[PDB]
Ligand SMILES: *[C@H]1O[C@H](CO)[C@H](O)[C@H](O[C@@H]2O[C@H](CO)[C@H](O)[C@H](O)[C@H]2O)[C@H]1NC(C)=O
């Protein structure tokens with residue numbers, strides 16, 4: 587089921603299970619147990635941008651930015667806010683902002 | 686500054 591205009595989603599590759607946030611909201615300190623650390627694709631709504639971290643709590647500027655529909659292949663080596671090239675395909679935290 | 690983490694308590 588596709589992300590709304592003002593919502594961003596990660597989706598388990600293996601199971602199809604979705605975790606979504608409206609624009610203006612972030613995850614807990616960690617994603618819930620039922621998605622944390624599963625390989626995902628991003629489905630970000632037209633007005634939304636998904637911020638992922640590979641660590642808990644969107645921490646140490648280990649943050650990557652995703653818009654539209656992104657497959658995990660294209661999330662393995664992404665320039666983070668901190669200038670490192672990280673893998674966000676198995677995220678531990680998330681925020682959704684306006685694109 | 687950037688968000689931080691802490692070690693899990695026992
Ligand atoms: C990192 O986690 C923090 C909580 O420990 C906090 O949520 C932080 O987000 C920032 O929080 C500020 C308020 O403390 C401002 O609201 C700021 O806009 C916001 O980015 C988290 N970092 C990120 C990028 O979400």
Ligand SMILES: *[C@H]1O[C@H](CO)[C@H](O)[C@H](O[C@@H]2O[C@H](CO)[C@H](O)[C@H](O)[C@H]2O)[C@H]1NC(C)=O
Pocket residue numbers: 643686688689690691
């Ligand atoms: C990680 O370490 C930080 C100090 O270097 C800080 O204590 C941070 O705790 C959070 O600090 C925020 C300010 O940016 C808010 O005050 C928030 O309430 C508080 O948890 C530490 N992070 C965590 C999640 O404990």
Ligand SMILES: *[C@H]1O[C@H](CO)[C@H](O)[C@H](O[C@@H]2O[C@H](CO)[C@H](O)[C@H](O)[C@H]2O)[C@H]1NC(C)=O
Pocket residue numbers: 641642643645646689690691692
């Ligand atoms: C909090 O948990 C993080 C993973 O979710 C990570 O382990 C982090 O480790 C800290 O990372 C910093 C990155 O600049 C420094 O290397 C710091 O030394 C290191 O402890 C955890 N933070 C803490 C304070 O335990």
Ligand SMILES: *[C@H]1O[C@H](CO)[C@H](O)[C@H](O[C@@H]2O[C@H](CO)[C@H](O)[C@H](O)[C@H]2O)[C@H]1NC(C)=O
Pocket residue numbers: 615616690691692693694
């Ligand atoms: C590290 O210590 C922190 C207190 O200094 C804090 O207890 C943190 O626990 C997390 O705290 C978050 C809110 O800041 C959420 O409640 C989260 O559920 C909780 O784990 C400690 N780290 C860990 C990994 O527990």
